[PDB]
């Protein structure tokens, strides 16, 4: 889950009140060695009927269906992984699949084509192993919260289009601002050096969202 480590890391940075530094040195908290491998570059909320489709920054695609099963298409365009509710994984391809999966494969194909023709790709200015899948997601009035199977939590804010990619394994957070600058910080260094009021506010929201994920599981 790693959610508990993330909650600890966020409560700690927020307790340091990072936007009340006599001198904020936010740039000094950047750490290129913590750039995340995976984040969600596009998503499509079709959850009143089928579910939530998304694209990862490596151009792989996934759907978390409303029955809480998952189908992941690797970025070779053919290799598939199916994950049942309990997490049981099967490996298959579009060319060779059980007929029971035809409907769900058809739906993933619709999502994938749409996200290849339409949306802007978050983090596109930044460059077949274990792909994470979408464990859970929810949306508020101000944001959509995405929880990946490798423990990263991504929060996309609707009103100003900024995004947080939180990785508890590196104890790091990546902030994509309005201008689509992509900046990766070590959370302990934001504790040390501070940050602007805007990012401090998103990090406060982030803690509350991680708390929600922890209080919501299974």
């Amino acid at each position: 889950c790693h959610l508990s480590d993330l909650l600890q890391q966020l409560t700690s940075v927020n307790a340091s009140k990072p936007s009340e530094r006599g001198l904020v040195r936010q740039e000094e908290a950047e750490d290129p060695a913590c750039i995340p491998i995976f984040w969600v570059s596009k998503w499509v909320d079709y959850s009143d009927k089928y579910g939530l489709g998304y694209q990862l920054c490596d151009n792989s695609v996934g759907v978390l269906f409303n029955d809480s099963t998952r189908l992941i298409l690797y970025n070779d365009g053919d290799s598939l992984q199916y994950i049942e509710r309990d997490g049981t994984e099967s490996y298959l391809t579009v060319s060779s699949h059980p007929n029971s999966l035809m409907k769900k494969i058809t739906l993933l194909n619709y999502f994938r084509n749409y996200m290849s023709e339409h949306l802007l790709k978050a983090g596109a200015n930044i460059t077949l192993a274990r792909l994470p899948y979408l464990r859970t997601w929810f949306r508020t009035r101000s944001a959509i919260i995405l929880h990946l199977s490798n423990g990263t939590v991504q929060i996309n804010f609707f009103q100003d289009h900024t995004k947080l990619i939180l990785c508890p394994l590196m104890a790091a957070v990546t902030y994509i601002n309005e201008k689509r600058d992509f900046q990766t910080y070590r959370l302990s260094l934001l504790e040390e050096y501070g940050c602007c009021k805007e990012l401090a506010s998103r990090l406060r929201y982030a803690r509350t969202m991680v708390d929600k994920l922890l209080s919501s599981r299974s």
Binding site: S41, K42, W43, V44, Y46, H118, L119
Partner: peptide, 4 residues
Amino acid sequence: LHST
């Protein structure tokens, strides 16, 4: 209903 879809991203940025």
